[PDB]
Amino acid sequence: AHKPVGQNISEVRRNARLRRHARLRKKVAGTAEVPRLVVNRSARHIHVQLVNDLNGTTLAAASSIEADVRAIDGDKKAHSVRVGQLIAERAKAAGVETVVFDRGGYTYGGRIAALADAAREAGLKF
Amino acid sequence: DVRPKITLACEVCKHRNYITKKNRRNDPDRLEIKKFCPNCGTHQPHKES
Amino acid sequence: SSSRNGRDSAAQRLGVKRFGGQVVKAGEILVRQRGTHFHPGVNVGRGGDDTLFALAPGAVEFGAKRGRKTVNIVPVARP
Amino acid sequence: AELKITQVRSTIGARWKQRESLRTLGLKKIRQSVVREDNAQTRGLINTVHHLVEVEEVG
Amino acid sequence: MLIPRKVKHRKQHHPEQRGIASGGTSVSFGDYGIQALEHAYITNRQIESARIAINRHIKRGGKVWINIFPDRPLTKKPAETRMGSGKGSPEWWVANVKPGRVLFELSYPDEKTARDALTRAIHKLPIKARIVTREE
Amino acid sequence: TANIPNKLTANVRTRTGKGASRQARRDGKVPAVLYGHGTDPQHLELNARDFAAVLRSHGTNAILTLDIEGTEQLALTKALDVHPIRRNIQHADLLVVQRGEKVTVEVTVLVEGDATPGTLVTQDANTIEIEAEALSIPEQLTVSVEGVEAGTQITAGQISLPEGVNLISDPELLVVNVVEAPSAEALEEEGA
RNA sequence: GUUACGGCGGUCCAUAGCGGCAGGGAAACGCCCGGUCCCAUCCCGAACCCGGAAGCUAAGCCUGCCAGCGCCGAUGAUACUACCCAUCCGGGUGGAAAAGUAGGACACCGCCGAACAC
RNA sequence: UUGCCUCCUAAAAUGUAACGGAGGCGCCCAAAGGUUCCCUCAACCUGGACGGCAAUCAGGUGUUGAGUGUAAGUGCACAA
RNA sequence: UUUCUUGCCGGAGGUAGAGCUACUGGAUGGCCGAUGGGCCCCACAGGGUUACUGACGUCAGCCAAACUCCGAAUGCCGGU
Ligand SMILES: [Mg+2]
Ligand SMILES: [Mg+2]
Ligand SMILES: [Mg+2]
Ligand SMILES: [Mg+2]
Ligand SMILES: [Mg+2]
Ligand SMILES: [Mg+2]
Ligand SMILES: [Mg+2]
Ligand SMILES: [Mg+2]
Ligand SMILES: [Mg+2]
Ligand SMILES: [Mg+2]
Ligand SMILES: [Mg+2]
Ligand SMILES: [Mg+2]
Ligand SMILES: [Mg+2]
Ligand SMILES: [Mg+2]
Ligand SMILES: [Mg+2]
Ligand SMILES: [Mg+2]
Ligand SMILES: [Mg+2]
Ligand SMILES: [Zn+2]
């Protein structure tokens, strides 16, 4: 008859991320001309989407789930670098050069910064 | 009186560029802050005259 | 005897200045208010005194977003 | 259909909207009569001045 | 006398004597009650007078509810004063009574004595009133 | 227990609104709505004398068979609007019911019996909420206080219900409170 | 294309919530293992961050089912009301609540990505 | 009593009188300003050396009843 | 003809009314029982009882210019 008494850490973490993602979104919005680059970061993987918030539509996406990234031999930062390059290539094919980076409610640094820097290096303007 | 009017002058050219107020009991020392100086055309240290 | 009252301040002429469907120029004041009874929406700015004003020309549109009442500017079609 | 509208009462003491609705119907004197089409616009004018006019239906 | 312990606003506009009572129009505690048929300000002194009249008639073995509390202040200026110089000081406490409002309720075993007691109270009130029962 | 429907003639209203309703009442008819699980509101007029007589005989929750354009419909008196001053019925809400349907109804609790001589019986609930069959609704429930002494508190759970009748009001509701009769001293303090 | 799937959005933002009962782990989401490295604690690798994959669906998350508490809610009637009749009260035409009732409801819609099918 | 600010009167745009009903101001802050990032009160329940209704600690319930330098009102938990 | 009038369409509102377990205050009667108070065991401790007192909670009936979960009719702004 086990009944948990409080909130598990995963519950607290999930809703706190959502909270501070919403906080960031008060100022960061995407358009067809300048899409929002949204990042989701798990322990295992990292995902990015280009979103136009006027339509609520995703223009391009990339993730560490792809076999091309799973083959990378480095650490999680190395996979983040690959995802950064893939999203820049797919966005430039979609006709986009300027984006606004949405850190998704995570601290800017580590894997997030490595993806953003790889995207900048491959010529996304942000 | 308690909050007297003070004039901030540029440390470089000494033009009296700004006027503001401070509590002289909370800040007995002469106020020193960086402000844009028109004559110099750049931010410079300014000090209470 | 005498009253301790007899005091009041000037009327501040607050309120909605441009109602639904009115065409406005950019910069035009839409509402005068004390707090955010109305929130800025699309192409509406909020002044330091919480005045709402147009950031682009168009028609004034009132709407609700997450319960907050909002003022919006919708672009008018060019002739 | 048509409505014959005859002014029965004076405009003295009548409010602005009443006086102007009579002008809009084309009535300017007691016992004058106008012929108007029975549409929504005409009904609204009559409703404003119903105490000042007599309405008869034609056709 | 019934007086409120405190009021947020001690000088108030007169209560408006318009409209039929929308609330408190039925007997809810006793078996008999007094229903108002007219608008009045009923003062705490009238309520006291009426309640004591009911008590004296039944002597004992009954319960009287007062459905109305005089929490509305009416002011008065000092005597022989000219108009102006501020609003007067509070002097009377009244209940804003509307037709249909049940003012008093009584429970008593004997109908004849109950009705007589309520009649004694009605003669103390500034208004016209009738006796009403819980029944339809 | 089984109640027979009382017949009332009803006609569909030609016009609705306060003007039409006031005229109907002036001509001695009461406006009513009939609405149902079938979700099909009908606007009716009833004769004021006949409807009032039914309510006098069988109480507020009378079961009626309405005759609407020759079609008989079973209905229950759901609610009554009674003018606070004139005591006339302004309007009636009638609920369509089929036989054997459970209906939640509020019934009148009557008090019967000689309390012990130094006692006053105070009734705190005029009414209790009940589930019953459309035709089994008791027009009045009686509680006996014939013997109870001061301090006793008849609650809703202690009242006899016929077969089929279920209690929806929670059992803790006081229906009757029996108290020792107030002295003249207590009358003088009460309400001072 | 179909899924007890993962994200990002939307709704004049609860008909979507709170709660109860049962169930789910393919890839994902998660707890989880561990501080050598960027980084971190007004103390604490709890959190934030980084490096991992031994364990587990017990929680979060997700799916099905309950109207218990919240929430939405008519029709009709009334209150109120604009204008007009009306020597005192009232009435007519038009508009029309709040509360309550019947009842609704354990959300719905868009884009992208998984995994599997073709 | 005389200028300024807030509320009610004021009749659901604005404005609206009286020696009508209530209060406040003639400042304060070098951060209590700018920006970036993070966080969520009050109250209540339970446990704990001094320690009590209430100090600091721990768990739970809690969507806003706390807090916004300073009157009041309009706002602000997305936080202001 | 930009004015006005009438029909229709787009708007903001907090009055009338109403409601309050939706807030801030006022407030009637039940029920329940912290809290003091009396008394019996008698130690001042732990407890058992009383024509006292009644928080908090709950059931039902209510009230407000400066109460509002609600909320018209008119009026007002614009378009046609
Ligand atoms: Mg300092
Ligand atoms: Mg003002
Ligand atoms: Mg500012
Ligand atoms: Mg400023
Ligand atoms: Mg005249
Ligand atoms: Mg009421
Ligand atoms: Mg798996
Ligand atoms: Mg750890
Ligand atoms: Mg489980
Ligand atoms: Mg309706
Ligand atoms: Mg309603
Ligand atoms: Mg105004
Ligand atoms: Mg007005
Ligand atoms: Mg004037
Ligand atoms: Mg509105
Ligand atoms: Mg009122
Ligand atoms: Mg009000
Ligand atoms: Zn200089």
Swiss-Prot record, chain B:
<dbReference type="InterPro" id="IPR001705">
    <property type="entry name" value="Ribosomal_bL33"/>
</dbReference>
<dbReference type="GO" id="GO:1990904">
    <property type="term" value="C:ribonucleoprotein complex"/>
</dbReference>
<dbReference type="Pfam" id="PF00471">
    <property type="entry name" value="Ribosomal_L33"/>
</dbReference>
<dbReference type="InterPro" id="IPR038584">
    <property type="entry name" value="Ribosomal_bL33_sf"/>
</dbReference>
<dbReference type="GO" id="GO:0003735">
    <property type="term" value="F:structural constituent of ribosome"/>
</dbReference>
<protein>
    <recommendedName>
        <fullName>Large ribosomal subunit protein bL33A</fullName>
    </recommendedName>
</protein>
<dbReference type="InterPro" id="IPR011332">
    <property type="entry name" value="Ribosomal_zn-bd"/>
</dbReference>
<comment type="similarity">
    <text>Belongs to the bacterial ribosomal protein bL33 family.</text>
</comment>
<dbReference type="InterPro" id="IPR018264">
    <property type="entry name" value="Ribosomal_bL33_CS"/>
</dbReference>
<keyword id="KW-0687">Ribonucleoprotein</keyword>
<dbReference type="GO" id="GO:0005840">
    <property type="term" value="C:ribosome"/>
</dbReference>
<keyword id="KW-0689">Ribosomal protein</keyword>
From Swiss-Prot, chain C:
<dbReference type="InterPro" id="IPR018261">
    <property type="entry name" value="Ribosomal_bL27_CS"/>
</dbReference>
<protein>
    <recommendedName>
        <fullName>Large ribosomal subunit protein bL27</fullName>
    </recommendedName>
</protein>
<dbReference type="Pfam" id="PF01016">
    <property type="entry name" value="Ribosomal_L27"/>
</dbReference>
<keyword id="KW-0687">Ribonucleoprotein</keyword>
<dbReference type="InterPro" id="IPR001684">
    <property type="entry name" value="Ribosomal_bL27"/>
</dbReference>
<comment type="similarity">
    <text>Belongs to the bacterial ribosomal protein bL27 family.</text>
</comment>
<dbReference type="GO" id="GO:0022625">
    <property type="term" value="C:cytosolic large ribosomal subunit"/>
</dbReference>
<keyword id="KW-0689">Ribosomal protein</keyword>
<dbReference type="GO" id="GO:0003735">
    <property type="term" value="F:structural constituent of ribosome"/>
</dbReference>
<dbReference type="GO" id="GO:0006412">
    <property type="term" value="P:translation"/>
</dbReference>
Swiss-Prot record, chain D:
<comment type="subunit">
    <text>Part of the 50S ribosomal subunit.</text>
</comment>
<dbReference type="Pfam" id="PF00327">
    <property type="entry name" value="Ribosomal_L30"/>
</dbReference>
<protein>
    <recommendedName>
        <fullName>Large ribosomal subunit protein uL30</fullName>
    </recommendedName>
</protein>
<dbReference type="InterPro" id="IPR016082">
    <property type="entry name" value="Ribosomal_uL30_ferredoxin-like"/>
</dbReference>
<dbReference type="GO" id="GO:0006412">
    <property type="term" value="P:translation"/>
</dbReference>
<dbReference type="InterPro" id="IPR036919">
    <property type="entry name" value="Ribo_uL30_ferredoxin-like_sf"/>
</dbReference>
<dbReference type="GO" id="GO:0022625">
    <property type="term" value="C:cytosolic large ribosomal subunit"/>
</dbReference>
<keyword id="KW-0689">Ribosomal protein</keyword>
<comment type="similarity">
    <text>Belongs to the universal ribosomal protein uL30 family.</text>
</comment>
<dbReference type="InterPro" id="IPR018038">
    <property type="entry name" value="Ribosomal_uL30_CS"/>
</dbReference>
<dbReference type="GO" id="GO:0003735">
    <property type="term" value="F:structural constituent of ribosome"/>
</dbReference>
<dbReference type="InterPro" id="IPR005996">
    <property type="entry name" value="Ribosomal_uL30_bac-type"/>
</dbReference>
From Swiss-Prot, chain E:
<dbReference type="GO" id="GO:0022625">
    <property type="term" value="C:cytosolic large ribosomal subunit"/>
</dbReference>
<keyword id="KW-0687">Ribonucleoprotein</keyword>
<protein>
    <recommendedName>
        <fullName>Large ribosomal subunit protein uL16</fullName>
    </recommendedName>
</protein>
<dbReference type="InterPro" id="IPR047873">
    <property type="entry name" value="Ribosomal_uL16"/>
</dbReference>
<dbReference type="GO" id="GO:0000049">
    <property type="term" value="F:tRNA binding"/>
</dbReference>
<keyword id="KW-0699">rRNA-binding</keyword>
<dbReference type="GO" id="GO:0019843">
    <property type="term" value="F:rRNA binding"/>
</dbReference>
<dbReference type="InterPro" id="IPR016180">
    <property type="entry name" value="Ribosomal_uL16_dom"/>
</dbReference>
<feature type="region of interest" description="Disordered">
    <location>
        <begin position="1"/>
        <end position="24"/>
    </location>
</feature>
<comment type="subunit">
    <text>Part of the 50S ribosomal subunit.</text>
</comment>
<comment type="function">
    <text>Binds 23S rRNA and is also seen to make contacts with the A and possibly P site tRNAs.</text>
</comment>
<dbReference type="InterPro" id="IPR036920">
    <property type="entry name" value="Ribosomal_uL16_sf"/>
</dbReference>
